[model samples]
Target chain A: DVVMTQSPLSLPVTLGEPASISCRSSQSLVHSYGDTYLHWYLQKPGQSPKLLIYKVSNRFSGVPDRFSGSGSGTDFTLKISRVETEDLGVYYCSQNTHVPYTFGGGTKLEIKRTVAAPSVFIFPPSDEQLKSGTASVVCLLNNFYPREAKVQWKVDNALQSGNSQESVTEQDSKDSTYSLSSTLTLSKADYEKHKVYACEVTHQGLSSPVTKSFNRGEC
Target chain B: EVQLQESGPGLVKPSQTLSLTCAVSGSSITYGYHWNWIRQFPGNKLEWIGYISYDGSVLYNPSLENRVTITRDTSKNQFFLKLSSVTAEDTAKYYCASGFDHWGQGTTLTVSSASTKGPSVFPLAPSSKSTSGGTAALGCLVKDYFPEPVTVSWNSGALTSGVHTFPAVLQSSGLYSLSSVVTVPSSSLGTQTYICNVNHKPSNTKVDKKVEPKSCDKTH
Candidate 1:
């Protein structure tokens, strides 16, 4: 088993700017086949992954010249001479030089577009209440791009002690933005006391976090 | 002046019999020669499929003995290959050859299941072999999946540097199974739970398992 590590999990690049990713393996990737088996792949948004480079430096058939690979043994790199809008997705480096083929933690590529803050919304619990004595509230973060988003639940300027479950982020098919939802469950005792539950969304796209709060009787 | 041209449907579903025909020109089945079938797998590994002799004797790769049958039609001047209970592992390029020399351009055959099955992820405790004072080894078993590949990742965030992941092997149950192991410094083992995540692309599903290294009970 060879270990592969990729850097810059999130990359933001300007159109036409050169970009590169680093892939490091735990052991030499040279196989008995007399060649290093490191390969590079790019997966465009909403499409299956495609091979870009094979056996280290050889570009696959029909691939553009800008996409190049370099390195030997344990360290390798994939470079795009000029970033294009279509290159926005994920890049993965895989190695079969050893048993149990492994891949690097993919690096996500994005165009440095003018981003916007996620739309923050807090909703009351639905009609279903568990007799077990807990209530659930939902918070949604949607319509932000080129920025990873994080959500925190605060109780009047302090972090909430309750645990929250976050969903996987999604890119809407109709639009090129991101959206996700999180759920926070509070004990009946906590909500009965009428505490202000605020959902704060943090993204580099905004200087300040956007927040939405919900309290009892706001219906 | 013998020519062989392989012909068959390129795609086949698992469990269905795979059948192909090779048309022979300028020769006869009774010409005292053996006609054989060979195939190339995804990794360029070639296997000698089977052959039929001019006297009507048949032989096949022992591994596929009962399932693979080769027969010929004297009047039609053609030979046929029939492989039963096929699995995705059986997908390959099928070619017909003249026992030792001339060959035909192979036809590709893909054995795929119509439905996708998600893999189950299971974690194993650190092994004694890897628990020696320096680095400890952890393992994960990802099994019973459809299709050829899956993506594996660790949740330790910063600790994984030396990981060994093996290619998926076909199980007797007609599914694929894989083993993945990673070694991290023993000092980092006692602090948190390590999670192994497997992503099955065909089904768009993911399963994860967690193991606390401290509970491994073999190392310092």
Candidate 2:
């Protein structure tokens, strides 16, 4: 059996900085065929782990060139150059030189952040649909700072219960920010009666709160 | 354009066998790539459980080797995993992968194990290496262990300069191996003892390798 030990459990990097991690295996990762089977993987937040490096130094398909690996036998290293915000995640090194394979304890890469908050947009329905007797309006919050944010809906300046609302928030790995969208479904009568509909977004990075207003479209 | 899908039980009791199947599409499971079962816990790292080769050979992570088996059905283009004596630690999202490049959507499985394991230490052999140009590499190999943390250090008589110690690494067998190196003049290597010590505190175990000058030359 071989054991893999990794260092610095956590790493903090500013945008466009460089980062490196070392991984050592209990046994030589060099196989009898003369190739080392050490591999590197990155598991981004909320995503499955992706193979970045394979067989010591070869990049996996579609891996960015900035992510590279080196070293052989029992000692291996994974390096990230000009670290992008998307690279923030946990990285692991594993060995396929022999069976059973093993993985190193993960090393987390955190991003240092100081950025603007997200911008919110409320999209009105293209055309009112009185034939179905119901209408649904969607609020899209984009370009937000901080990975966490909340979306709230209001009708005619009054807080509306979100029972008919469906909301989804996702962090953009490329930008290291959050974007949210929520659909507010309402009856056509209420949709027309409530002349003012608004979406309020809340985030720690925001000064107060950002809101976007929209009016019902004519059927 | 190949695809993989995993199917398995959602829950298993302690000591029960965990069974799962991987249905592969667009490619023959009997050829081209190895089919493997990998798992991940919420907010935790991914674990490679084992794989079944196109040639029908199987390999498993030594930590789960004794309790794991991988088999396949050629006609169905599918592979299966059966893990025995599972516990809470085994609860995870299991995915089927084709040589790690293409993977299936994962299925979650929960297990309630009746036992727990803490970090423990074990014994290992210490071996030393001397390369040309006044350089030396020393290693302590540990095998068949649990958990991932261990510490290693090197000691030689009255000498502590230019010494570099590497952290303990995990092996496929689930054991730990630690290595350290120091460079002394090749001519000064006569009749000196180099000691490699391993400390695994959680298991309260201490193993030392004392390499007397003559035995230091042997590969560990």
Candidate 3:
């Protein structure tokens, strides 16, 4: 069972602004069996919960491609590129991979008046290239002011007690990415057990911490 | 074009299991989806009768819990529904739907307190709907065993009294299948629980039929 933890707690923005939240898993969900477990759902205020992503990023029965889910294992992320008027609601991250299934404490996505878009794409190393001794896991987004977005790293979708950091940068992009990247230094023991890592790029629409992981020998 | 029909004896004793089978014609059972069983009680509500899959996947309305079981045999192109621990409340008109696509003329099942009559009952055969507040029609197959002829009147309300039977006529299988349509007001029809009581044997024995109206969308 994975316990999802959200960071920065709240978002400050007017309508039409993008927001993000993060979710981490407890154990390695990527199995040799298949990749049809990780899924994300959105409960927009009053309506019934609709499946946004199923089996790791594939849109469900009836969902728009704009509601995208990317990342694997505990390092999963649900991203909504452009904010919509109807999209103002709380977003939750859920994992059907393990039971006693659980859902992360949802983060509210609201709106506030703002002219400058956030610029920081806490893109986690894009490549799954992590070494054994000292590893740095980062999440980066483009556009939004990095100062506004905080970085949170989680293990197995669960908040790692002592490891969390926040960073911001002023990157130039047509549209702000508002990336929040956090890095976790892992020991040999932590590397083996910590197969899933989440780097939540916290913003209004930011959902489920951006997650990634590594096995000891898998390069 | 092939239609499915439900054939079984009405009126089962209390504590006994009530069983009924649906026989299909025209379309082969091996080709289509599973058959469905839906039921409605007298002055009560409509409950899903469950369905039997072609390969035998049995699923029931979680609400019904365990009182019902539906089974089928693809070889025979027939399906069955069994309700255990029968009681007066369990008495209802049962219907068999085809693969959630077509419907069969329903067969009525009444659980009576007396067994001395040997399952002697006036079964209700009728057409049903699938949506709430939709029009429903109930028909009865009246059979006059005695030498005297009598009149059948369909009366339904809060309380039933007097004779409720229809004039008998020679028809299919030596019995009269009399049908009447009642445009049940949507507000009046709550959850498809209405009855078509057949008052017959004018002497005093009044036979009333409680039918389960189908959903408004249930019809083709």
Candidate 4:
């Protein structure tokens, strides 16, 4: 079986701009007859994967000329001379030069829209945590581009340190951006004593930091 | 100069058999090649149904066997596909292939169902387009069913307060499709094994889908 690997799993391109994806095979795709066996496909949203190119660089019937492919041996490239609005989806490269044909992990092409601001959300402690005499609160930073967000936790009028864990930024599905979450641990008594808890987030996607606060007795 | 064209009835009934044929031209069916039947589902998932060898022996996917048949007609230079006990999940765009490079244009097949079929449940996943992490939305899809009132719940009724089940839509083929979403906190997002339970009343079957999203390295 052949193994196909693709790069830049997430692709962002503006309309009318050019974009490309690279696919590499674990072994040479040259058949004994000397023709390479690489193919390209695009799976649009909620639609079946339609063939784009076959046999290294030939476009399938009815495929637009803007979509092109070029490669040989073990390396291949699928290029869009000018990306159209309808071109946003997942692109897959497949190989059948060996037994058990395989496809790449697939690359997602997304429209590079204008920057969108991230939302800040705050969560209070759960019932089990309160019963345990200690609690863990949460701060979620969601829906932003470029994956840059600074998170801080605020207790009453004082700034907190080391109370929150490191955050993880994950890419949103398809053409969307990124989201992150922070967890803060504290004693239930301290949580009840505190008047307010806030999650403050700053990102380049926003002009100013967004803060969302949770009331002590509201959980 | 070999050519392949697929021809078959575009519609099939549930629990019945689906039959299709690939008419090969410019080459004999007894050549040293494997004739294959591949199908693409609605979600871009491609499946290799099976193949008939030049020697006349056959092999299938083997995932869940015993319901498939592949036969060839050497006199007509054609081969056939017969998938038995079909369901709505078997609806797909079917294509035929010879050797590896030649393929026939696909033909769409719709499996119309009247009743007496259990719902098929896909894997549950966290919604990435909307929100993530703490208070994240988890969703699942159920399809290929009849006689509605399917119930999808989360975590032993613990998170039922935040469940959102969409209305089941009847497909053009008469089979049903459904989806549901529920919000879970970060506590259950880690190693916690939360449950998504689905009970299709008419099918008299229940599915308990236990899933957990993995934790990752530090990033912000």
Could you estimate the TM-score for every candidate?
0.47, 0.51, 0.30, 0.48
Cα displacement (Å) at residue B204, model 3:
11
**lDDT of candidate 2 over A1-219, digit per residue (tens):** 578899878765777888999998887888888888788888765466788998888998899989899997788889988899678778988776777767788987766556657655554432313454645555655555655677888888998784343333333445555444465666677777878888898888788988877555421
DockQ of 2: 0.08
- By DockQ: ranked, best first: 2, 4, 1, 3
TM-score of chain A of each: 0.82, 0.52, 0.46, 0.67
For model 3, the docking class works out as incorrect
What is the descending TM-score order? Answer: 2, 4, 1, 3
Worst 10 residues of 2 chain B by lDDT: B119-128
Q: For model 1, how does the per-residue alpha-carbon lDDT over A58-176 read when each residue is reduced to its tens digit?
A: 98877898899999989899999999877778897877565445668778886555676765556544323424465556565556785578888886567865476555343443445
Give the C-alpha miss distance for residue B65 in model 2, angstroms: 3.3
Tens-place lDDT digits, model 4, residues B1-220: 6688888887778899899999999999899888988787654556667789998998776652588899999999999999899998887888888744566777778776576677765433442322444566555555557755588887867766545555555555476666555556655565566677889876798998765432222351
> B1-220, model 3: which lDDT tens digit per residue?
5577887677577889888998987876666575777664542233555677677777676655477888777677788888888876676667786643355667767665532211112322122222354533233333323212333444455423211222232222222222222334444444455555544342344565554432335242
Error of 4 at B212 (Å): 29
What's the true lDDT of residue A7 in model 3?
39
Error of 1 at A32 (Å): 4.3
Superposed Cα deviation of residue A73, candidate 4 (Å): 0.6
Docking class of 4: incorrect
Q: What is the lDDT of residue B108 in candidate 2?
A: 80
Q: What is candidate 1's CA lDDT for residue A150?
A: 81
Best by TM-score: 2
Tens-digit lDDT track for model 1 on B1-220? 6788999987689889999999999889778877988776754334667789998998766777889999999989999999999988898888797753456777888787544788866554453333346666565656568765798888834545555455565554567766565656666765756788788987898877775532323342
Predicted chain B of candidate 1, TM-score versus the true chain B? 0.53
Looking at candidate 4 chain A, the ten consecutive residues that score lowest on lDDT are A166-175
How many clashes in each candidate?
5, 16, 75, 0
In Å, residue A207's CA in model 3 sits off its true spot by: 65
